[PDB]
Structure 1
Amino acid sequence: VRYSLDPENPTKSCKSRGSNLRVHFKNTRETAQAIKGMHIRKATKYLKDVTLQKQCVPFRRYNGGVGRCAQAKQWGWTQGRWPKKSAEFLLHMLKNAESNAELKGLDVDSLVIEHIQVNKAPKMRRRTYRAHGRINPYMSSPCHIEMILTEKE
């Protein structure tokens, strides 16, 4: 398919993709800000400590009602949350971002995450049950992702 901003160093920069993966959008977007521009083997070591609640992920845009925590002072912010499902999937395919990279003959120990974006998926539906005999929808909000991994030289 076609990405956004196909790479300027096209032989020596790798790329991956995942579509219609059931995570929240507002928790997959805001774990993607926190690793944007980070070296991969530190970013892989980052997302493990998110799920083990050692090193949080700050919420900068979608900060409605999010309770404070102390680990967010590293990122200059007061609110944080530890997504152990959202930082699972894009841990699970930074595995599959570099599994393509050395398949193209690239030294993976110099990769940094250049580009990453999250964009929503068609919201699949099921229904709730409310008062006075009314129905409202439980709408899941899944999301696509997209990423470019670039060696620095």
Structure 2
Amino acid sequence: MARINYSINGDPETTSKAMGSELHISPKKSREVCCKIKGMKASEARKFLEDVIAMKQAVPFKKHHDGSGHRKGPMAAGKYPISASKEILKVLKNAESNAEYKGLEPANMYIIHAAIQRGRVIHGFMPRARGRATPKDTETVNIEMILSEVR
């Protein structure tokens, strides 16, 4: 419904921020993607996300492993969160643009903070057997991204 504060506030001088505002994506898959890309350079994070969206690269699923098989290569359970990857890539593009506007250089910046926040839920319903209607909700996700040029 409104704007949101960030969990972490980097210093304005050498840091850029962006917020994906209540996207209709999976909070669990986006949480896994944010766990994967935090700490990476912005360019390498973009390349990794493009590979994931292209199915050339799986993200490890260490917290929400149910429903995921093991992936080839040195990995346990992992998936290809296409929708979450696309939304997080849009947020990363916005943060890189904000860094450029600040006068900073996104080519030399790092994703120091990438977190999700569950937003307000849009409540739907799933009609069931025997006269029962159960929920089917639209979960929204806020994506917090902070780029910094120092570590």
Under a length normalisation based on structure 2, what TM-score does the superposition of the two structures give?
Answer: 0.92
Aligned to 1:6: 9
Cα distance, 1:114 vs. partner? 0.5
CA distance in 2, matches of 1:104, 1:141: 33
Under a length normalisation based on structure 1, what TM-score does the superposition of the two structures give?
Answer: 0.90
Cα distance, 1:5 vs. partner? 2.6
1:14 counterpart SS class: strand
Question: For this pair of structures, how many residues does the alignment match?
Answer: 148
Identity %, equivalent residues: 36
Q: Which AA in structure 1 matches 2:8?
A: L
CA RMSD of superposed structures (Å): 1.4
Cα distance, 1:123 vs. partner? 1.3
Partner residue of 2:42 out of 30, 40, 43: 40
- Asked if the contact 2:14–2:150 (Cα under 8 Å) also holds between the matched residues in 1, the reply is no
CA distance in 1, matches of 2:150, 2:53: 28
Q: Which AA in structure 1 matches 2:6?
A: Y
CA distance in 1, matches of 2:24, 2:78: 22
Partner residue of 2:114 out of 108, 113, 116: 116
Q: Which AA in structure 2 matches 1:89?
A: E
The correspondence of residues 56-75 of structure 1 with structure 2, limited to 5 A, is 56-71=58-73, 73=74
Larger helix fraction of residues = 2
User: Structure 1 residue runs of 4+, over 4 Å off?
Assistant: none
Partner residue of 1:130 out of 110, 128, 135: 128
User: Which stretch has the larger CA shift, 125-134 or 23-32?
Assistant: 125-134
Q: Which AA in structure 2 matches 1:5?
A: I
Aligned to 1:147: 145
Q: Where do 5+ consecutive residues of structure 1 fail to align?
A: none
Q: Where do 5+ consecutive residues of structure 2 fail to align?
A: none
Cα distance, 1:109 vs. partner? 1.1
Cα distance, 1:20 vs. partner? 1.2
Cα distance, 1:39 vs. partner? 0.7
